[PDB]
Design a protein around this motif. Sequence first.
Motif, short mmCIF file in Angstrom:
data_model
loop_
_atom_site.label_atom_id
_atom_site.label_comp_id
_atom_site.label_asym_id
_atom_site.label_seq_id
_atom_site.Cartn_x
_atom_site.Cartn_y
_atom_site.Cartn_z
N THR A 126 -35.78 -39.17 0.09
CA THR A 126 -36.84 -40.48 0.57
C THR A 126 -38.04 -39.20 0.26
O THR A 126 -38.83 -38.74 0.48
N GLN B 261 -41.74 -40.74 1.60
CA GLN B 261 -42.57 -41.02 2.57
C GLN B 261 -44.33 -41.73 1.81
O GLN B 261 -44.95 -41.15 1.79
N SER C 153 -45.08 -43.24 9.20
CA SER C 153 -44.46 -43.87 7.46
C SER C 153 -43.35 -44.24 7.03
O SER C 153 -42.69 -43.48 7.75
N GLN C 154 -43.28 -44.87 6.20
CA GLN C 154 -42.68 -45.64 5.95
C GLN C 154 -41.30 -44.31 4.52
O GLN C 154 -42.05 -43.97 4.23
N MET C 155 -40.33 -44.25 5.09
CA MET C 155 -39.31 -43.85 4.56
C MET C 155 -38.49 -43.91 3.60
O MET C 155 -38.35 -45.43 3.38
N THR D 239 -40.31 -36.26 1.24
CA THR D 239 -39.77 -35.09 2.44
C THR D 239 -39.60 -33.59 2.14
O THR D 239 -38.31 -33.98 0.80
#
Lengths: 520, 520, 520
Positions: C124, C126, C185-187, C436
């Motif tokens: 991922t 982020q 935060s968007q993963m 990540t």
Amino acid sequence: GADGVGNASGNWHCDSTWLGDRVITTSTRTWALPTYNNHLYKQISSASTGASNDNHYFGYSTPWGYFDFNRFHCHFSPRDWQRLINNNWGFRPKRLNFKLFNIQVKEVTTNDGVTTIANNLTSTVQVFSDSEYQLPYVLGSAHQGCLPPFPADVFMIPQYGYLTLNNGSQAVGRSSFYCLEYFPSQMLRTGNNFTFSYTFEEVPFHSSYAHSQSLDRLMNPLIDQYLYYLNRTQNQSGSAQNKDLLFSRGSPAGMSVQPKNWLPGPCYRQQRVSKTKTDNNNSNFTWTGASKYNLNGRESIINPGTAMASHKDDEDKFFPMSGVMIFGKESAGASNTALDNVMITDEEEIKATNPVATERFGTVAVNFQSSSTDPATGDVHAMGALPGMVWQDRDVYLQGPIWAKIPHTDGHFHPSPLMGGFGLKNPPPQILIKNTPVPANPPAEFSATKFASFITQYSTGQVSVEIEWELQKENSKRWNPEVQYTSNYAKSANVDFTVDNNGLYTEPRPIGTRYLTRPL
Amino acid sequence: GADGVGNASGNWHCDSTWLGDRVITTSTRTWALPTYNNHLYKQISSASTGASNDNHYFGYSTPWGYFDFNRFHCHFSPRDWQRLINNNWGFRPKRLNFKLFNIQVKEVTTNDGVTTIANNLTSTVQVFSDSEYQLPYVLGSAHQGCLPPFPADVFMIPQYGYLTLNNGSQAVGRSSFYCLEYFPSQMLRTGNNFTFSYTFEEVPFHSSYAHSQSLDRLMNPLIDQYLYYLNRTQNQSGSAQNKDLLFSRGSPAGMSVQPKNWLPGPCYRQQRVSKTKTDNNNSNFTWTGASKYNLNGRESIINPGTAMASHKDDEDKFFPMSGVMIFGKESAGASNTALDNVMITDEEEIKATNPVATERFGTVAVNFQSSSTDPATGDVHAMGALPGMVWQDRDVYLQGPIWAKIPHTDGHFHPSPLMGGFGLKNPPPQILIKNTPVPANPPAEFSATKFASFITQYSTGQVSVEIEWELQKENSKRWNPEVQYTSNYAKSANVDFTVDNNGLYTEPRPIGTRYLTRPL
Amino acid sequence: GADGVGNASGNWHCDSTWLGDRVITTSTRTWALPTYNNHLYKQISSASTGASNDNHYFGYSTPWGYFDFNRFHCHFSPRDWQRLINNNWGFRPKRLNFKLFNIQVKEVTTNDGVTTIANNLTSTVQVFSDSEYQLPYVLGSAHQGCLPPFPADVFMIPQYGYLTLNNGSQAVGRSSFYCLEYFPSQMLRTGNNFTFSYTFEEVPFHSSYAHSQSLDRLMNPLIDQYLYYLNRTQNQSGSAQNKDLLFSRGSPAGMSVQPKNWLPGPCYRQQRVSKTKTDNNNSNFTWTGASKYNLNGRESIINPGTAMASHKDDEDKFFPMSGVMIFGKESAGASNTALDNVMITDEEEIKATNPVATERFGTVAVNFQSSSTDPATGDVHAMGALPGMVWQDRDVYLQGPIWAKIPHTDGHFHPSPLMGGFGLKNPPPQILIKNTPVPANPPAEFSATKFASFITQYSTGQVSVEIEWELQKENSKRWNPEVQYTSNYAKSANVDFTVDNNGLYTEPRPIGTRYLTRPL
Ligand SMILES: CC(=O)N[C@H]1[C@H]([C@H](O)[C@H](O)CO)O[C@@](O)(C(=O)O)C[C@@H]1O
Ligand SMILES: CC(=O)N[C@H]1[C@H]([C@H](O)[C@H](O)CO)O[C@@](O)(C(=O)O)C[C@@H]1O
Ligand SMILES: CC(=O)N[C@H]1[C@H]([C@H](O)[C@H](O)CO)O[C@@](O)(C(=O)O)C[C@@H]1O
Ligand SMILES: [Mg+2]
Ligand SMILES: [Mg+2]
Ligand SMILES: [Mg+2]
């Protein structure tokens, strides 16, 4: 319109409004009209003089004058021209609005040395437009008398004349005589005005672009063709010179022999002459070496002729002898003025599609090669329409003509007017204007002999012309910046396209339209 | 379309459906796309090399490739071609349906001698069609890279390049640079598909017929004309050779002098060369005796040129030097391969309306005969469009091109694409395909210098093209049987249009369309 | 967004759409993100090194990187820049649309000499935008790492670092430490995408024009003023030099003494240095003769400083030592590269309103003249805001910055960002992106010591930015043509703003915006 003597009949509409895909120009100028020919028509002829058979003519001069707004600087200011040529791929006329207003007739009396000019409030100027094209169309021959480029410049109205058939100085049974008193015309005292409106037919957009590609460079340079062409007729790798038939397929290492889909435009070669007098022949060849046409045993130079490129890459010094348009500077005389009093246009940007005017079209087989008869080619100097041909018509110039009437003939091939512009079945019509004759005092006894005694008088008024043009927007996906027209950032004693210290507007160079580019 | 990795995105639509006056073909092929140019554009030039001014070029190679289905064997199987050419008087394109599906991106790693190819399931190929024709149109130049004739044959996708203006190896201010990353393009992982559909403009049917009549044989052979022609200028039945003016009316015993209504087509003669090497000149004339055109001081051979007949009656051994299309057999090399490795087409069936390419057009008076000055004629080797002319355009071939984009010019005369086919204002657009670059591992410290390190990767997928063609039915009232195309009933080691024992499909001869006949 | 692994998450939106008074640009580029700092933050300091007190700093490097599209060539292609600068009087940002899509995380394994890169489908990246401006704003400092000018160019994502208070190498109690793991935060796995949209505040149009008039030439040259000024203090026409008080009214023959309404802009003089090395002093003065500012006992050069003209009329050879922006060519090194590896901008067109940077502002009385004490003036080299002043802000460049965050202070005077552009209370926010961390295999016994062993991995994806700009149309009533930007019509080996034969795009000159003109 009806108005007292003290009451304007129109306003000064001059402007420049752009909206979306349309540009509406309006220009107003003030005109002086004199009595022409003493209110008489006069037969005019090449009789006497002894002008060469080429120059022999027969026709008429008319008491009327006409309006002519058939030049772009009539309606486009140079900065407006720039907006067109710098951002549009095309444009064309659409509608037209014309108005005659504020007309003032004046009487002139000359006594001894002193002249007096007074207002005649009861005199009439008469205007009519030839909307049925019943009169010989004299517009579209690049004459002077048009609306001036600088709105603050007052112009004289040119006089109407026409011509018909001539054998030498004599005329023929079919020749035609036109009385403009025969048409109905609007009469106007200082209170009256006059208006009409006109719509152009559908015509294509003019090409305010150049090609970023040439006819011989349309293929993909990374990919051989599947087509094959006969490559050698004498064996490679043979100890002697032995006959062979060797075929090769299209390759980037030889764009010049790859089969292609198209032909350049038609050509009609003209003599090449250098702007530097030394390189030229020591003779006077502008006629004897002229490319001309031959109509009714009468020769007439071709100018500007079929649309061709003006010089090749890196040969900027040349030009076709009668295959470019040339504008005189304001200083230039009427005949035999030097090189730097005129401005020669350069249609070089069409070398992409069209032959260079000074060169051959191509080469042609002219025999049957055999082991005995050596093959032979000759050059082509006149090449008519061939299937496959593509071409770019001759470009337009701020100073150049806008349109022309397409001759009324059984037949025409691609009737763009040769000097540039729009060829129109039904152009904007002529506007004929004349001052009504004002007889002076007749005798007190009757005399049926024609009246020859008139108050000398001239008229002045304003004239308004509104034209809506359509624009063709540029959609180019070109990454790099295009060439654009630009005034010179650097210093100089004179702004371009301006009055000088005496008050004279001067147009310093001819400005054409092909600056943006698109693919071929 | 959206689909898992394990889920076909399209099916193999290939077929051949005839209904009424329409034939719908659909052909599916599978393509390999590599990384081109290392995801870079590169300026390409004739710089160095020293190629003749004719061959000088300037342009660009692109990271993208394109699809090309501009050959008939892309959509017509030979037996389907036979159905067309054997029973129809004409046909034309109408609509088009295109699909990209089953796209698989693969990663390639080379370690020592061994190479491994694995599936990259997250990588994307991007496709877009140039529907506004904003990119230089490179189709319609007879290039390779098209869909293969044999559906079971896998083809590589050609790379896109284009060109712009060039003076020598140098470029010019107007030349244009195109970034295909500037257009919006559809991105696809192995689950996505891509489709578009296109309609052809109205164009005329192609002439899949020959004339059963010739221009000089249209009159009734049993009936004199009422027109008269000047027959003799020297008296018949006079003891001396005395001048006379004798007139005769049109008669069957003299078809050659009967007044007629029409002219043959335009001509632009080309050199005649025999297929038997002996009869030819002992020189290498394919350039020096070439019929060429001259654009911007640069010569380019005319091929295939104005549509003309290939040889006269009984002279089957000849052909115009650059006035016929020549397909190479599969064995033929790229340059200087023998006669029997290529196939030369024979457009002889148009000799009915069109000049023979190797011969003059006609004869022309070139002086004024008098009792003193002997009359004189000369030959015509280039004849442009004359009123009255009728002509048959160059025929199409199973292997030949289908269409071409008509250049975007102010002017074009009869813009059939010279190599045969349909000239289109708005052809089918180019389909540009590129593999998205996949950066390898960047450094761990930042570096703004351009990224030069990428996973080596290539993609494969299928491509589908459905075209609906209209047919023009044959209505002929001919009693006797027409000529028809036919495989040879007799025995031989190889069926025509087949694989051989190694698995190679081969097209044995070029097949054109003119077999049925109609009156002129 | 939610999508399988084999399923694009966005398309390649790149384009250039003009409509009315608006131009919408969209540019898509593909980015590589590496692991930075080994997923660690690291205190960074000027400790050791011994950098001069001026250069001492204290701060942090971050495991995250950021997106930066704060340069015009990020969204304006050069030909689009031309359309702006050639036809508009102004423009400004309005809205913004951003998208992260097609993200691919890859794993890297190094064994011996050979490296293998495979897809990690469960990892991922982020992303989060600092919409509350809670993080030190590092954009708007002219850093590298921005979106590349050439869409086909792949760029590495710069790493985020910031700074806080420093005394020498040491820090202070107020200094601030930011953990970007503290924000939400968007993963995203390879199936996810990310988008946000932003609106600019109202700001004035940028001045894409020059003045056709100067501050000292605004009066009517034909009309005396009614104001009077003290002209002489020593009698004209006196045999001796006798004291007097003589007054004259404003006259065209003396524009230099006419009372006026306005003052030029503020000035802060900088050293003048010639582009020709000979004329310059034989010393190394770029610091000792630098015009600098003094903050907290620490000196920092002023560059580019208050907006001033670069040279006067006819002195093109000079430039302020730190008062012009200078772009390096692609070849230029990082330090001490020659003159012709860089491009120096010329803000000379503002000399109409603003002082020349290299010259004094004016002269000032500095005593009380009497018959005994001779009058005295001194020069002004720093001139702060005076009532009456008018000025033109420093112009923007295709390569230059677009905006900057106005510092959050109690006070600011005319906060245009000194390097050019829009000063924004709430600019577009920073977009922070990080991979990540992926731990490798832990031990089989527990260990609470920080994890230091991770799969080496980097990510790549595309990024999309759509910006709507407003345009201010040009309404100029200028008759003569304006200066316009233009590629050079003449020949050369390289098109401007293109790739070369190795594939390197190069921007050949800096392009500003002031070409059209309006009155002052
Ligand atoms: C690309 C090109 O112009 N090729 C031409 C060549 C070249 O002049 C030689 O290959 C010089 O290397 O000459 C020919 O006679 C030939 O040999 O086939 C004709 C052909 O058109
Ligand atoms: C049918 C035909 O071709 N007629 C031609 C004849 C024949 O050659 C002779 O009649 C031979 O018998 O020759 C002419 O010069 C003539 O005598 O009028 C011209 C005419 O065109
Ligand atoms: C127009 C102008 O600059 N005038 C200035 C003149 C000129 O230098 C002389 O008139 C030279 O002819 O000199 C003054 O000292 C004066 O004599 O009043 C001051 C004044 O400002
Ligand atoms: Mg207005
Ligand atoms: Mg079926
Ligand atoms: Mg668009």
